[PDB]
Write a protein that binds this ligand. Structure first.
Ligand code: NAP
Ligand code: NAP
Lengths: 353, 353
């Protein structure tokens, strides 16, 4: 009953969860899609609401991965949208290897492997706007190892490949290790709960510089596009919303969305660590979860305040989308509207109040 | 034999000359187009090579404009892509008024008026990225007067309107008062002629900041789009290539295109005036024109070194293209390729060697 069969590795992820939604849409290219969804944790109740076949599997475990993925003979497309959570090149490589060694010898109709890395490929720095043809930096980066494995395995087995390097992701998953919007929404939620203004903790430059990002749905569209369009086969491809923004403008919108007052960047002041400010807010979040009858999340799991700290001390990281556009991909998002869209969606899904 | 009849006011201009080419293409929306081309100077020999009906007319002269434009009964679309060359609000307004008072009472099939202004509407400043809904600055700007005239005249006479605010234009016209690419090509040409490196004269920030621009052909496409598409009627619309660049990268490409060595921005050094450096190069340019058998241009007419000086002390002027994209306009250009395209085209047309 299916035309294509997808293996989404990291289905609970910030992009994986989007693929779980987009792939199942009736007019999605390559459809109708059958979707295998792989993650380490037991299937979340909110993901059980989706028509995907969830496979709980520790992908870093070769024998377990072989055991659970080798019976899947009908897979045609692999979407690797995971990482182990550390910068370890070897343990990250093992995960991707295990996926490949378990599926390739068992899926006689396998066609394409989508590999998701990121713009960190460009600065670990190269100057921006980042273009896909920029050579690797002379450092260790697990993105490098993943690429080399991709080239080696797809070539020997007559498979097409695509490398996707998304910018900062605007998404809705509460299970992501790096979800900036959920992180800021939690921070805003705690501020309103304690009757405090939304105080910008970041640096001056990050407040005022041009920044870019990518909607999680657009990444999914981009990866599906490369999975079905011949023009995008065997290509390295950046992926962002196609525009630029400033955190100063996002911050104001975030404050309005939560109906609280805002304290923007103050001249002379240095950046403060959000990870430190929120260090002891675990019980407060538990109270908010209960009172608002939200989907039960741990503060540590829905928010990554350390990740916001890095974003708020970064600049000059704009990536170019010209290559994808010249290849025919005309997908885009208004980044300001995308950010608001993610807030509404996480409220919708009762991840945040 | 024509479906639409265009009045291009400023046909020798950096955008007007592009309209003269694009409108006459067979698959251009609204085609086949008849094109009236209006400018003050006698018709250039290179413009006589185009199938447009040239009308030499001083548009600031009401009686002359009435005399030459009132017999044109068949006009359906007006493309105002001119200005007088000064910031004078009244003399600029008179030009636009004279066009309207001469055509509207005489063109019974008039439908739409395209008004081209620019991003100067946003800083004369507002913060960027500039969006079309930003209110007018509390200053005198002839863009304001042109808009008010547009609203007033189109409303009373049941006409649709469109306001186009292009970014810095990458074009090919040698008759433009503000052509940055021709200006830099002339500078590069003189450098190679005097056996000197392409020394960057601008500021540090302009060398290193994100910048945007718009291809002259894309502006034409954008204005034609608004002229034929209902979704774009009665809208204020930005127009850029849809990406960003840095002058540091453009400068390197410019040096390669002319086969000469480059001296980029040097730390500690202040900006130098190009208008001063090139002040006495008129005869040198005449020599280059003769030796290379180029189309006869005066240094003052093909180059605007004062304009490059302003561009090389500017920053934070990025404009947003989201509105046009959300309205269905998916036209774009790779700015780096667009810049190279303009160089090749001016060499093609023998404006530069
Ligand atoms: N997030 C961003 O903003 C962003 C932006 C640009 C690029 N990237 C890059 O995109 C890539 C994908 O990261 P992401 O941010 O999409 O990840 P994410 O949202 O944090 O999700 C990671 C997914 O991988 C799964 N996973 C982790 N370890 C596993 C294991 N041992 N076995 C099975 N599944 C495992 C997780 O499930 P469990 O939770 O059950 O383990 C989760 O579903 C990364 O390389 C990242 O650097 C991310
Ligand atoms: N150039 C850019 O980079 C740029 C970027 C953004 C916005 N803009 C804006 O776009 C608008 C159009 O300017 P542009 O740069 O396209 O102009 P341009 O390339 O300098 O050409 C101006 C045109 O207007 C004609 N003109 C001037 N005075 C006239 C008169 N009295 N009677 C008849 N024709 C006359 C000129 O013909 P003659 O030479 O024969 O007089 C010329 O064809 C301006 O408001 C400008 O601010 C320009």
């Amino acid at each position: 009953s299916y035309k294509s069969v997808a293996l989404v590795v990291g289905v609970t992820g910030i992009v994986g969860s989007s693929l779980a939604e987009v792939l199942k849409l009736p007019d999605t290219p390559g459809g109708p899609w059958k979707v295998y969804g792989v993650a380490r944790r037991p299937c979340p109740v909110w993901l059980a609401k989706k028509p995907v076949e969830y496979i709980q599997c520790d992908v870093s475990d070769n024998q377990e991965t072989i055991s659970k993925l080798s019976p899947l003979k009908d897979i045609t497309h692999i979407f690797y949208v995971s990482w182990i959570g550390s910068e370890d090149c070897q343990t990250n490589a093992t995960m991707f290897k295990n996926i490949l060694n378990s599926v390739i010898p068992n899926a006689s109709n396998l066609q394409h492997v989508c590999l998701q890395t990121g713009i960190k490929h460009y600065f670990g720095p190269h100057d921006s706007p980042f273009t896909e043809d920029l050579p690797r930096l002379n450092v260790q980066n697990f993105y490098h190892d993943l690429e080399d494995i991709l080239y080696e395995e797809t070539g020997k087995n007559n498979l097409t490949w695509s490398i996707h390097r998304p910018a900062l992701v605007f998404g809705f998953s509460p299970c992501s290790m790096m979800n900036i919007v959920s992180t800021l929404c939690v921070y805003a939620t705690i501020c309103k709960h304690e009757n405090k203004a939304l105080v910008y903790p970041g640096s001056k430059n990050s407040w005022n510089c041009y920044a870019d990002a990518v909607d999680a749905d657009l990444v999914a569209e981009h990866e599906i596009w490369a999975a079905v369009d011949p023009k995008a086969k065997n290509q390295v491809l950046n992926c962002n919303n196609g525009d630029v923004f400033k955190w100063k403008h996002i911050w104001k919108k975030l404050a309005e969305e939560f109906g609280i007052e805002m304290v923007g960047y103050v001249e002379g002041k240095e950046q403060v660590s959000l990870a430190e400010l929120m260090k002891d807010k675990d019980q407060v979040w538990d109270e908010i979860v209960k009172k608002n009858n939200l989907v039960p999340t741990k503060l540590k799991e829905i928010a990554a305040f350390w990740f916001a700290d890095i974003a708020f001390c970064s600049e000059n990281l704009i990536s170019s989308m010209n290559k994808s556009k010249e290849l025919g991909f005309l997908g885009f998002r208004n980044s300001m509207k995308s950010f608001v869209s993610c807030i509404d969606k996480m409220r919708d899904y009762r991840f945040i109040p």
